[PDB]
Design a protein around this ligand. Structure first.
Ligand SMILES: [Cl-]
Ligand SMILES: [Cl-]
Ligand SMILES: [Mg+2]
Ligand SMILES: [Mg+2]
Lengths: 232, 8, 232, 8
């Protein structure tokens, strides 16, 4: 790896600089290098890893959507192969990023994660990047969807046993599993039920929280509420 | 309109 | 070149798709491939080339500025080499993009450009990308600054002889030469004089224009006015 | 504050 000669701490320091500079491809390469040093990741380092790849894949998804829409309109008008070719190029790059993240989780972040906060974070991530693969998949599709579902479900079982209902990781997991149900799995009733029960149980636990934790949890709860407003 | 997923 | 096997027209088509998808690195690679086919560029193709590289280098400049500022603060605190190293990495990538554009202009866009609209466009571009090199240069700096000045001056002499004062290319050239004077050459009085005379002569020619041309020229004139408000 | 240069 091209980061094999750089110190772990220097890679983390440069990841933080790339974030300030909005250089997210660099940020992801630095954090991949950090993971490949073989030590477990702290809470802050896990969030750097997630921020970097979420921004990289987020730009790819936005581009694939523009191009797929142009491609679909062309098949309703006048006629060549360029639109399909360039959508395939972007799609292939997107899948490579997803495969890179899933490879880091499998070698060996997940198997070394013993605490609930790290294990749930990484299993959620696995579900997320199989979900991004599913958005562009065309049968194959079914195995990818089941891999996302399986990772989210394992994360959910742990989080319900081990975390309070207002925990931001538990909330973000439930939010994203509900989006999976609505957008990927054709199960809008399951999406709605999960979002409502997640929101209601967090509401009833807010009284236990400090002012800072209260702000953290209610921020994510608002996203559950926004989705419910769109879905109903 | 697309559903909102978790923020950073 | 990796685009050597793709048709010229397909490269232009994909450049337009990359722009819709905000994939500006791809856009620039496609337009570099198009230039390397060896044919001259139409007005529309010249603007695609400029849009693509302006966006790529624009993101690099914004990142270099964030990092240079962090670096300067560190030299006022607590103390390692990482900030400098990563600024140098971004700076080196920026200089490579500038050198790529300048190489396309020198091999062989400028020498084949005979009409005023193409020759002024390419000479302005040359001044612009030497100006971006100058923003990060540290003596060397003087030769780079004179190369920018020389390219802008040749473009200015042609544009004043061959184009009306409201021509959008002539206006954009004068705008950017005035920014050179103010930001690079330490000549704010020259910047102000050029912007005022450019604005005043365009004002007096607006009566010759159609409604659409009037909108095109007054849009750029407003940037001259905004700069004068900041500089005085 | 930085001077404004030509737009696309
Ligand atoms: Cl392609
Ligand atoms: Cl570096
Ligand atoms: Mg462990
Ligand atoms: Mg010619």
């Amino acid at each position: 790896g091209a980061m094999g000669s750089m110190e772990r701490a220097s890679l983390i320091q440069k990841a933080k600089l790339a974030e300030q500079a909005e250089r997210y491809e660099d940020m992801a390469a630095f954090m991949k290098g950090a993971v490949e040093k073989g030590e477990e990741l702290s809470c802050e380092e896990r969030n750097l890893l997630s921020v970097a790849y979420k921004n990289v894949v987020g730009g790819q998804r936005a581009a694939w959507r523009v191009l797929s829409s142009i491609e679909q309109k062309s098949n309703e008008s006048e006629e060549g192969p360029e639109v399909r070719e360039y959508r395939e190029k972007v799609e292939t790059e997107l899948q490579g990023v997803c495969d890179t993240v899933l490879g880091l989780l499998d070698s060996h972040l997940i198997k070394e994660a013993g605490d609930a906060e790290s294990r749930v974070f990484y299993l959620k991530m696995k579900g997320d990047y199989y979900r991004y693969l599913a958005e562009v998949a065309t049968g194959d599709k079914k195995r990818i969807i089941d891999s996302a579902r399986s990772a989210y479900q394992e994360a959910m079982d742990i989080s319900k046993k081990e975390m309070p209902p207002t925990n931001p990781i538990r909330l973000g997991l439930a939010l994203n599993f509900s989006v999976f149900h609505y957008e990927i799995a054709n199960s809008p009733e399951e999406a709605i039920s999960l979002a409502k029960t997640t929101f209601d149980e967090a509401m009833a636990d807010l009284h236990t929280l400090s002012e800072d934790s209260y702000k953290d949890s209610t921020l994510i709860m608002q996203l559950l509420r926004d989705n419910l407003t769109l879905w109903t | 309109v697309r559903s909102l997923s978790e923020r950073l």
